Every structure is written in C-alpha cells, then in structure tokens.
C-alpha cells in the first residue's frame, strides 16, 4: 500500500457519451460507484433529462434534436471548449461509450483527444455491439474503435457478444452491457489511494495504463473454500478476455470481497492471476472490501500492452 504524499487527492472523471454510455454511467452512479465525478455527453438534449450524472452537455444542435458518426464528430469538435471546461482539473479521464451509433462512435475520440490535451491519464472503455443489433453498426463500431484507439493511453474493448445458454431479452441484453462497462470502470477506481484509504497509487496505474495500448477484460465470481482462486481462474478464462495474458506488458488485477477477507486468499489469487502472465510483465493488484458482497469473492483483470 502506498500513499505519496497521503494528502493527494486524485480527480477522477468518468465521461459517458451517446447512449450507451449515458446509460452505463447512470449504472455506475445507481450501483453508488465512488470517488468519481460523472458526465454525461449526447447530442439528444431529451435522452439527457434521465441522466443522473453530474454533469450534462448537450452537445447537439440549437433548435433541434439528434445515426453517422461523422455527425458524432463534428458535434463533439464544435464543443470543443465546453468539454475542455468539464474535464479540467481531472488527473485521470474514462470515456466510455456503446460503440456502433453516431454519437458514442464519432464523439469518444474527440473527448479523449481533449482529455490528453489536458494531460489527463486518459482509458476508453467501450463495447462493441451486440449481433443481434446488425452489420451497419457492428461496420461503424469498428471503425469508431480504431480511431478512439490512437486517441487514448488504454482502450478496453468489451464484445458485449461474449455477454450473452437461457434466452435473455433485449433490455436484459442492454442492462448486462451497463454493467460490464461499470466493471471495467470500478475495476481500476476502486483501487486508486484516497487520503481516507491507502491502496494503489495513482502513480501506479499511470505507469501500467500510459501509453500501453489495447487492454482485454475478464470478471470472475465464486463462493465456498476457494472462492478466490476459483473467481481468479474464471477471470483469467473469461470468454471476454479470451485468455492473451501471457502477452501483455502489463497487468491489473482487483480482488473484491465481504468483511471477512483475508489476506491468505488474495496472496492465492494474486500468484495465480502472476503466473498465467509474462515473467517480464508488470503486475499491479489491489484488494478492497464491499461489505454487501458476503461468501463472494469478485475477480477483475485487465491486461495491457501487446
Ligand atoms: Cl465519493
Ligand atoms: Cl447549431
Ligand atoms: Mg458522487
Ligand atoms: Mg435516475
Ligand atoms: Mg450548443
Ligand atoms: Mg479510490
């Protein structure tokens, strides 16, 4: 655990933008997501008025409402200064979005672009869709993911396929997606030194997340006697990380549990998680208790650089 100094309070800002990320950071804001400030950007002034976030910006058109990601684009672009004021001040930025429609797509690079002018520690993290939302979005999602990619110092791409064997609804579909997106996010937060809680230092982070590149995901949960070797081993085989481990050049790993965590269990998880990446990797791991969580053990890994 370290602390330097013990008084640094890092500023965090979490941007959603388009609907799919409006919509994950009101997941994030319901699930009472910590230490954070949250914004909500979109280009319809309407699917704004639900969010919960902190900050809103219509980054819309005057005397109208609302597809193209080069629409996504300009709009961002023309707002230019109004971002730059809303992320002003952050050390570290997430931008985060639902790949593949015309706001999310076209608009994250320019937020992440501004969010690094300003010399924030910057992390997309993005789903691409899912197939049952069709071939033009899952075009423009791909084309949208290599532009924020030579914007950002991290992209975590989540393929919300790997999601969903019992047949699920749309919005169950769309409710699992929020969800992942605030897993990528709390991830990396949760961890990060706070005055009141020493941890993870945000040097730390800085130094796995800068620069790397790509980043894959995996979550894992268990119960019982090994529960956190079992949610470590779930998530080091998590369909969504598609097991690349042994190729970053970096990896993080969070360990989440109830009260009665001990520290036997998170040194298992935490050799287990080492030992599946490269001998010449860096490894960061941090532990935080979530009292609500009980017998369950929470495993979040992110590997970075390739
Ligand atoms: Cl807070
Ligand atoms: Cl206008
Ligand atoms: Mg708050
Ligand atoms: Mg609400
Ligand atoms: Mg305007
Ligand atoms: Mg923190």
Same mark, same amino acid.
């Given at each position: 655990?370290?602390?330097?100094?013990?008084?640094y309070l890092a500023v965090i800002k979490v941007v959603?933008i388009?609907?799919?990320?409006?919509?994950?950071?009101?997941?994030?804001?319901?699930?009472?997501?910590?230490g954070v400030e949250f914004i909500?950007?979109?280009?319809?002034?309407?699917?704004?008025?639900?969010?919960?976030?902190?900050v809103?910006?219509?980054?819309?058109?005057?005397?109208?409402?609302?597809?193209?990601?080069?629409?996504?684009?300009?709009?961002?672009?023309?707002?230019r200064?109004?971002i730059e004021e809303v992320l002003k001040g952050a050390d570290m930025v997430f931008v985060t979005?639902?790949?593949?429609?015309?706001?999310?797509?076209?608009?994250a690079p320019v937020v992440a672009n501004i969010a690094r002018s300003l010399g924030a520690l910057t992390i997309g993290v993005?789903?691409?869709?899912?197939?049952?939302?069709?071939?033009?979005?899952?075009?423009?999602?791909?084309?949208?993911?290599?532009?924020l990619?030579?914007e950002v110092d991290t992209l975590?791409?989540?393929?919300?396929?790997?999601?969903?064997?019992?047949?699920?609804?749309?919005?169950?579909?769309?409710?699992?997606?929020?969800?992942?997106?605030?897993?990528?996010v709390?991830?990396i937060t949760?961890?990060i030194?706070?005055?009141?809680?020493?941890?993870?230092?945000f040097a730390?982070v800085k130094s796995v997340m800068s620069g790397a590149?790509?980043?894959?995901?995996?979550? $894992? /949960?268990?119960? *019982?006697?090994?529960?956190?070797?079992? #949610? @470590?081993?779930?998530?080091?085989? +998590?369909?969504?990380? &598609? !097991?690349?481990?042994?190729?970053?050049?970096?990896?993080?790993?969070?360990?989440?549990? $109830? /009260?009665?965590? *001990?520290?036997?269990?998170?040194?298992? #998880? @935490?050799?287990?998680?080492?030992? +599946?990446?490269?001998? &010449? !990797?860096?490894?960061?791991?941090?532990?935080?208790?979530?009292?609500?969580?009980?017998?369950?053990?929470?495993?979040?890994?992110?590997?970075?650089?390739?």
């Amino acid at each position: 655990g370290v602390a330097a100094p013990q008084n640094y309070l890092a500023v965090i800002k979490v941007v959603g933008i388009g609907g799919g990320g409006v919509n994950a950071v009101n997941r994030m804001i319901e699930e009472g997501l910590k230490g954070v400030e949250f914004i909500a950007i979109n280009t319809d002034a309407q699917a704004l008025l639900m969010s919960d976030a902190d900050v809103k910006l219509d980054v819309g058109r005057e005397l109208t409402r609302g597809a193209n990601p080069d629409v996504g684009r300009k709009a961002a672009e023309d707002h230019r200064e109004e971002i730059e004021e809303v992320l002003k001040g952050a050390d570290m930025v997430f931008v985060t979005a639902g790949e593949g429609g015309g706001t999310g797509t076209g608009g994250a690079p320019v937020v992440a672009n501004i969010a690094r002018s300003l010399g924030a520690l910057t992390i997309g993290v993005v789903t691409r869709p899912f197939s049952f939302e069709g071939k033009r979005r899952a075009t423009q999602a791909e084309a949208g993911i290599a532009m924020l990619r030579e914007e950002v110092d991290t992209l975590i791409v989540i393929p919300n396929d790997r999601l969903l064997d019992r047949q699920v609804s749309v919005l169950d579909a769309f409710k699992a997606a929020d969800q992942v997106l605030l897993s990528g996010v709390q991830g990396i937060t949760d961890l990060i030194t706070t005055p009141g809680l020493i941890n993870l230092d945000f040097a730390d982070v800085k130094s796995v997340m800068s620069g790397a590149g790509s980043a894959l995901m995996g979550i $894992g /949960s268990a119960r *019982g006697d090994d529960r956190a070797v079992a #949610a @470590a081993e779930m998530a080091i085989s +998590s369909p969504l990380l &598609e !097991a690349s481990i042994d190729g970053a050049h970096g990896v993080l790993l969070s360990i989440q549990g $109830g /009260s009665d965590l *001990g520290l036997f269990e998170i040194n298992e #998880a @935490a050799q287990l998680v080492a030992n +599946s990446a490269a001998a &010449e !990797a860096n490894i960061i791991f941090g532990a935080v208790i979530d009292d609500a969580l009980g017998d369950e053990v929470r495993v979040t890994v992110i590997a970075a650089g390739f």
